[PDB]
């Protein structure tokens, strides 16, 4: 395993998802996308500093918090190779079941670190949310607020969606899940018919790694498709020419949050793509080492 960036964790409410890649939060892509919305309204052209004084401060604190867990990440990577490389396994002096117990303890400690050291920043996300709700209030319109920008940003978003190869990922993950369990069932039969446990544990462990990353690939794929399908629906549906300000606020929140999910999943699906590509090359090689 060259990199273990594929690990993530969500809060106990399962509402805030933290990733090892910038900006770690979808909410920052929300706030980053608000820098586009605020440029079109001369009535609120004060967010250029707020994005720099607050959103950049929140992002800088988020990057530092992940770096604190880097020492804990290096400990997990060491246990990854001992368990996935039988040649490296034959050097230590404990059983495989004893090494799994050290892996689950170190993994959740690393995943728990990303959440524990970022709890102060997750509470800051809702702070800028209310500031955005308050900042948008300064629009001089009240009952006939313009919706041209709202649909114009959907025009921009649907262009970025065509660069996203969602169909290729679905066929990729379909073959992968078909190839994953097919190799798992083949190991289930060989398990009792040979006597090479050290190599079989490297299979089942790398299979467990694939199974977890597949779960992350399936979740990020569905969240991307949901954002793509919902934003597309707002362009094919009704197009009101002017709505109220309170109605316009949730509009920016609706597409500003959805596009944050798409860009967040685009960063994760790309990373989870190579992670599954790399991890499968381990199992295919490890089975070649069995014959």
């Amino acid at each position, epitope marked *: 395993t060259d990199n273990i960036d594929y690990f993530d964790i969500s809060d106990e409410s399962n509402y805030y998802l933290i990733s090892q890649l910038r900006p770690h939060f979808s909410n920052i892509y929300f706030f980053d996308e608000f820098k586009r919305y605020a440029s*079109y309204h*001369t009535e609120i052209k004060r967010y250029e500093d707020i994005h720099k004084t607050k959103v950049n401060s929140l992002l800088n604190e988020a990057s530092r918090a992940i770096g604190i867990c880097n020492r804990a990440k290096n400990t997990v990577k060491g246990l990854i190779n001992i368990l996935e490389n039988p040649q490296k396994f034959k050097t230590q002096r404990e059983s495989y079941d004893v090494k799994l117990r050290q892996y689950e303890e170190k993994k959740e400690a690393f995943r728990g670190c990303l959440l524990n050291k970022n709890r102060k920043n997750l509470d800051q996300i809702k702070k800028i949310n209310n500031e955005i709700r308050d900042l948008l209030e300064k629009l001089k319109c009240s009952q006939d607020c*313009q919706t041209n920008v709202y649909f*114009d940003m959907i025009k*921009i978003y649907l*262009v970025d969606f*065509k*660069k996203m190869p969602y169909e290729n990922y679905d066929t990729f993950i379909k073959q992968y899940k078909n190839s994953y369990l097919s190799g798992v069932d083949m190991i289930r039969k060989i398990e009792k018919q040979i006597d090479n446990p050290v190599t079989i544990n490297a299979i089942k462990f790398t299979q467990k790694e694939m199974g977890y990353i597949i779960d992350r690939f399936e979740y990020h794929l569905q969240k991307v498709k949901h954002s793509i399908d919902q934003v597309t629906a707002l362009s094919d549906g009704v197009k009101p020419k002017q709505v109220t300000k309170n109605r316009l606020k949730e509009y920016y929140f609706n597409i500003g949050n959805y596009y944050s999910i798409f860009k967040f999943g685009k960063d994760s699906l790309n990373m989870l793509n190579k992670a599954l590509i790399h991890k499968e090359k381990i199992v295919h090689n490890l089975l070649g080492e069995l014959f």
Partner: antibody
Amino acid sequence: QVQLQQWGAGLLKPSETLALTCTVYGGSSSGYYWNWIRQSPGLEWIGEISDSGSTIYNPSLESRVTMSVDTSKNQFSLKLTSVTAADTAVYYCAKAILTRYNWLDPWSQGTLVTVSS
Amino acid sequence: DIVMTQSPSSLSASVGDRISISCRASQGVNSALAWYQQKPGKAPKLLIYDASTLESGVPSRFSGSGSGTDFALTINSLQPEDFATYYCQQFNSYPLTFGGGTKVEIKR
């Protein structure tokens, strides 16, 4: 939706200053990227400006173009200098959303500019 | 300074025909192309942007294809309401360069 209305002086003596202006109806003249294109019997791109701070002109006439955006009056103006017969064309203003998404959805009806004494 | 060139410069077709104008770019321009239509004594009307995206309300017979260097606009079922001069414009770099135009004279 947003509309564009262009007004200016068509006839121009040489060496004068071609000064046009486009007033935006249905939307604010702010963060949008506003372009200027001229057509002579083809379509030549003059320049683009934005309230954000990105203003780019065509190198062929960079040394003579001036653009501005008035958020209060909801207007943006183009300016040409040292005008000659080579600048006789129909001048359009158009709206671009972003600096990487420069397709121009609305066009003004144009102002036929003739350079002659 | 990207040089956009579109061919043919003139085109004549039947009423129920199907034409296809091509636009070639001097350099790679990814999928950043806008196709326009200009009727006499009017302003250019947007038809297709980003090579494949159709503008709202534009008739669906207008087809956009191509990526990178070469592209093509295809009218699929001609109509007397399509006699115009069609252009292609890129926006991967500045300055924005327009095509030469393609006059489509309908035969009746």
